[PDB]
Design a protein around this ligand. Structure first.
Ligand SMILES: Nc1nc2c(ncn2[C@@H]2O[C@H](COP(=O)(O)OP(=O)(O)O[C@H]3O[C@H](CO)[C@@H](O)[C@H](O)[C@@H]3O)[C@@H](O)[C@H]2O)c(=O)[nH]1
Ligand SMILES: Nc1nc2c(ncn2[C@@H]2O[C@H](COP(=O)(O)OP(=O)(O)O[C@H]3O[C@H](CO)[C@@H](O)[C@H](O)[C@@H]3O)[C@@H](O)[C@H]2O)c(=O)[nH]1
Ligand SMILES: Nc1nc2c(ncn2[C@@H]2O[C@H](COP(=O)(O)OP(=O)(O)OP(=O)(O)O)[C@@H](O)[C@H]2O)c(=O)[nH]1
Ligand SMILES: Nc1nc2c(ncn2[C@@H]2O[C@H](COP(=O)(O)OP(=O)(O)OP(=O)(O)O)[C@@H](O)[C@H]2O)c(=O)[nH]1
Lengths: 406, 407, 406, 406
């Protein structure tokens, strides 16, 4: 038997995902219709031998997290527990702090997944490689562009034994095309270096990449497993859109009943579109590629929706165009209003993609990105929101362009 | 018997041109050490015969609002009540909706005061002009620059009798250089035209006071002006509040000489006018430049240079930091050798009586360089420059930011 | 042109409904399936000429109240406005304070409705009796039992013209057997006495019963309209149970699709039972008379449910017996656990009924009434909760009998 | 070098016997004027060598507990740290789970204190007994009656070497007069038997008294240090009033500036009375024995206060008699109002006897005990509140006797 540890963050790691995170926690943001960690729990309960799923984070258990945990426990036939760490303990410090609960029942190995990644999660093939080799650390790696790889944790390996010889968390200079994916397979022996790291701290917070992956690289403990299935990070509020698009593309294999079909008496559907059943979509509303509709969403007639997330309880009145946007919970977009953004994906194989920095401005100018509307934002009739971020509970009366509307 | 009505706004109507804060209500923001409406309440409770003080707004009753009401009631031994509207009723709709509460006790007159002004508040001078005149609407007006007069309520008066003949609220072309200060003396008959505006609509109860009652009743012998020479500013932006802080710390030299910070050469070096709370800990090596206001429980380390800044309560500035032109929010930490700097929004010093322009956070799609705002519980790391940035509340930074809005 | 003023209270009004008012406000408590005031709103929106519904209370407008407001505005196609008062102004002082908002549009008349009452709401009959004579106050009245009438507002009338000669709010002896129903029809002239009352307090708070009805009774202003329909007050937390019984009896005539039908496929039912469509009920559940089931309720195989109210998200495991109880939101009753109460209907006509005090204890013993479980109370297996009150978020381990579990 | 673990509870633990106060946590309740665990932190920081104080519990960190931690760190010049358990873990499971934080820095011994005890805390005496023999467990023992000891953990000791030969936690018939006090002194080897318990549950929650003390008794690890200082459990509200009395008696010998002297320009003061400096007490108020006033309390002219606690912000108007009560914070008692409770104190006929904790309900009947007025409870003028429990945010309007007013 095995178990999974999904490292969800806490409220400080959700600061970068801020317009969206004001209402829900970041790991519960619905990416292609289901919350962000439900893709992880989906992929982990698909593995034969999964006993437990242990979320580690420093979120307080509010109503949405505990209701999600009970819903995941019923839907996925597993005990899904939430281990709240007493302090922000870094990446590996919460795995070392909870080692008695992780190793309870003596699992053969355990997965360690970052909650902010979108992946196909090739957990079975990682397990095949681990049961072949039996090493302390198995990392998942992807190939990136040489220019984009500097935004990520670079891995220099040995292409015959697949041993990580070098690891650097964000190098200024080129190191390697292999980037860490935030998916790991630890054996129980892997909790013995972390102990050492913690003991060296006494002369509690352990960063897994800077203190364990970069230290034991080349000593025989850390190994790679490569893929090139889908992979994305979700850091800012608008990388949720790229993650949603990748997931809606892989629903063509894993859940094709989530994807909506045209059915000539209904709304006109291009590309991959998720529509929740509670949503009412008018038959003249064409829903373009990579759209996901939340529950309780009333989409009026003639509404064009392309490359967007419309969250729960939102309302798009007649003849609206919503492109590359995230319409928040309960937001209302009046008739002939245009909410337009600019596509900006992380995409580590795109040589023109931005670094996904925390600074949204270059020199006073807001860089063109996804248009985020917070919850309860009333966009008036006949008005354009272009490349803007609107903070929650803001009733607007005016056209806004390249602005953060506080 | 006189009473006072302070029109405080509400959660959406604040519309912060560049935010002073995010989590405390805008009337309770400390300008020159004390909350923005406590200057109004001091000025009103100094007036003899003033019985009651009413705050009309549509803020929900949170805890800071209630504890400020109790603190003001205890400090001035006046009733200070908060009449909350069922909706945003505009500038005159809350006066018409609460006219039985306003006119209970039968006052001789009532002062209507905008919450977001910094004023000398010559309430006895307006009171004496009105006791000589006995007119329905008396307005305090100042003198504006010709270019900047278009942002305020402009007044064509008659200079012999001091009667408003024409009123435009926010013009596009110049009509006058007299501007409405936002301070009014109302007779108990001034509620009688407000009713008329309501009955023009009912043929709910929103009445813009300046656009419906002042713009349309001018020239009819009903509105009169009282021209003043003292300090006056509008407090809308963050730089507008730093300017109001400078004006009020100037006026503290002859109203509250105990409130300013003297040198005390065992203690911190004081340049200019500085307010320090008695509970704040300021290390003796820290030099505190002009127009600095320190809240309660603020810890200031050694060698801290504070110049033209508001440091709200609970904030900790560690050693060797430089905070200039900033509003360090409550509970915010600035670590060693960090520099939190903003750009001053100073009036045009070549021109007579330029008041202030309030920056609108974006000029033409570009972010404007202005005051640096740190939100509540913002952590600035050691050895980091924050320049012209707004850091949203509860955000631990890790690098130097320049001309950002860090969410 | 008519409108309706529904006097919902505030939190101090709803403290008498304490186990259940921790979660939702009292007017939004679901009685026979829908919230308490949606009965009033639906019964006003069938009056020809009804143009506005105003809710006057001192509840702060949090998320559930404005969700209810928008949902009713869409469901009944009427403007449902909420008028929050600056201070708790009594029963009539909030009508006097909001007079310009009520008298807007020059309405012919307006119905004042207390939120706590359960009624058939005979609004058209009061309307016709008003249009025949046009008096300042029309009161709705019922005949009570001579013993029970001392607990209510008694109206001494003249039996010919039906004009009030006397009003006493809580009598000491028998004054009359006609009691005040909390349903009123006001002409626009009715605010001319209220103003007088307000001025008499200056040389704000106005009790409509004690300051307006007690004074103008016998002076030719107040008239009565006797009715025979179902009438109840919902003061205590378990008078909602008797109200839901009366409303589920009215549902046979007014909304017959809300009741459940005996079918081979699902559970078998005796008497009037409301089951929500999103509620999963097992076929071996026997849902006895006067039972309301909320959305998301799982009712296990073998559950006996009789004279109860189950609320949204609650779980009853197999073989449980729930009788005369109210099961709060998300509560869990484990298997073979029995949640029993004693019927305690307010019942003015009945001569046996309790006086409905705010006490609940007689001589140190909790008087036997409805067993209320609060929000998310977890009840273990094989345990008895008999005549008890469990405050919310309690995980019991024991049998409890005639207690309050704090 | 030593440190001190105080085992504060969590929200489910410690609310059952009676409610001292509904809103602030049980460890933050002011017993004799200062919070309940400030007596522990006082006694612990007064011990030479004490480097840290840890608070192990499962309360979520809110502004009361965080603000108290800041205040205590500032006052006592120690680091005072709250360690939140991820789950309720028992009285030994939190000690074992946070063993890397407790044993960090090499303490030579650490105290473990139950948060709900009144004691003089002879920590230097226990430390002198431990520095002379260096055993894994040192327990504080008191003597109890031969019918009260069934309610405590009983210790059969050796009269000469003071070694526990038997431990029983809640016996059914009489075992020993020596009872466990909830004050322990652990050596760093004492976290080695705890690990031995933990693995034996593998085939996290560790009870200290039932798994560690009761099963290692007689092997050479658990010893006793007998005393006869002040001692009490603080479980119910009568327990809190009595522990306030014991601490106010000890304030004569330790903090004599806390007790209130006469000051003939002030109130009349009988017995031991703590008054906060920020409180406002009229000169005509007679403050009887064992009263403690919180901060910002206005006390009117002619108030009688006897055997009572008045929390921060409460106003008692003129001529009120508050006897044997806890007036919660922000409460208001009107003119000529009586708030009375009945004390079921220690036996007058037995020297040995402790305080029995009543359990809110005995023999199906609500017991006459301390009157608890909750937070912002408004008691009207000329109203008697006898033996009642008024739940928070309640305005009453009449007299009540032997109730729980919801
Ligand atoms: N009760 C209530 N108060 C309000 C509302 N809206 C604004 N207020 C408060 O009423 C005052 C009026 O502000 P604004 O309506 O936003 O206009 P303004 O830009 O401040 O202009 C007014 O004051 C200027 C002086 O600074 C004048 O120049 C101008 O003529 C006008 O009087 C402010 O204190 C505002 O907070 C409302 O809907 N209800
Ligand atoms: N961290 C943590 N602390 C806890 C937990 N459970 C209880 N505590 C704290 O541990 C202390 C006592 O534990 P209890 O087990 O609830 O106490 P008791 O049954 O009433 O009796 C205890 O004290 C008596 C003397 O006061 C003793 O006789 C007895 O042996 C035991 O220590 C209290 O401060 C309680 O808040 C827990 O799960 N986790
Ligand atoms: N449980 C838990 N998870 C965390 C914590 N910190 C980070 N994580 C998770 O692990 C991922 C790592 O994020 P970061 O802490 O930013 O580290 P990084 O991805 O290597 O990038 P850098 O910021 O350059 O260090 C986060 O996206 C979270 O999913 C933590 O303190 N506790
Ligand atoms: N808006 C508003 N509504 C109120 C206020 N007080 C009561 N109400 C509502 O109006 C109705 C009258 O309340 P009650 O005074 O309790 O009715 P009652 O039957 O005369 O009195 P009791 O049953 O003895 O408590 C109730 O439905 C309340 O919800 C108030 O101050 N403001």
């Amino acid at each position: 038997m095995l178990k999974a540890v999904i490292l969800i963050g806490g409220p400080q790691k959700g600061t970068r995902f801020r317009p969206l995170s004001f209402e829900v926690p970041k790991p519960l943001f619905p990416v292609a219709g289901v919350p962000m960690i439900q893709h992880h729990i989906e992929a982990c309960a698909q593995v034969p031998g999964m006993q437990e799923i242990l979320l580690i984070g420093f979120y307080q258990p509010d109503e949405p997290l505990t209701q999600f945990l009970e819903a995941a426990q019923q839907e996925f036939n597993l005990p899904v527990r939430y281990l709240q760490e007493f302090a922000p303990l870094g990446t590996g410090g919460g795995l070392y702090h909870f080692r008695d609960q992780i190793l309870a029942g003596s699992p053969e190995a355990f997965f360690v997944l970052n909650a902010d990644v979108c992946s196909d999660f090739p957990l079975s093939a990682m397990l095949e490689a681990h049961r072949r080799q039996r090493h302390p650390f198995l990392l998942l790696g992807t190939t990136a562009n040489r220019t984009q790889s500097l935004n990520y944790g670079c891995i220099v390996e040995n292409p015959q034994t697949h041993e990580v010889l070098h690891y650097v968390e964000k190098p200024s200079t080129f190191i390697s095309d292999i980037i860490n994916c935030g998916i790991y397979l630890f054996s129980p022996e892997a909790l013995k270096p972390l102990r050492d790291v913690f003991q060296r701290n006494q002369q509690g917070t352990i960063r897994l990449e800077q203190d364990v992956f970069s230290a034991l690289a080349g000593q025989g403990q850390i190994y790679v497993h490569l893929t090139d299935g889908i992979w994305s990070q979700i850091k800012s509020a608008g990388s949720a859109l790229y993650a949603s698009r990748l997931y809606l593309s892989r629903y063509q294999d894993t859940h094709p009943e989530r994807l909506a079909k045209h059915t000539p008496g209904g709304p006109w559907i291009r590309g991959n579109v998720y529509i929740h059943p509670t949503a009412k979509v008018a038959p003249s509303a064409v829903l373009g590629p990579n759209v996901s509709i939340g529950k309780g969403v009333t989409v009026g007639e003639g509404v064009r929706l392309r490359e967007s997330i419309v969250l729960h309880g939102a309302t798009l009145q007649e003849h609206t165009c919503v492109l590359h946007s995230i319409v928040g919970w309960g937001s209302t977009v009046g008739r002939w209003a245009r909410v337009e953004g600019t596509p900006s994906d992380p995409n580590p194989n795109d040589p023109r993609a931005r670094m996904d920095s925390e600074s949204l401005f270059k020199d006073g100018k807001l860089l063109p990105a996804i248009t985020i509307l917070g919850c309860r934002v009333r966009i008036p009739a006949e008005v354009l929101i272009l490349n803007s971020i609107v903070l929650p509970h803001k009733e607007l009366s005016r056209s806004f362009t390249n602005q953060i509307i506080l």
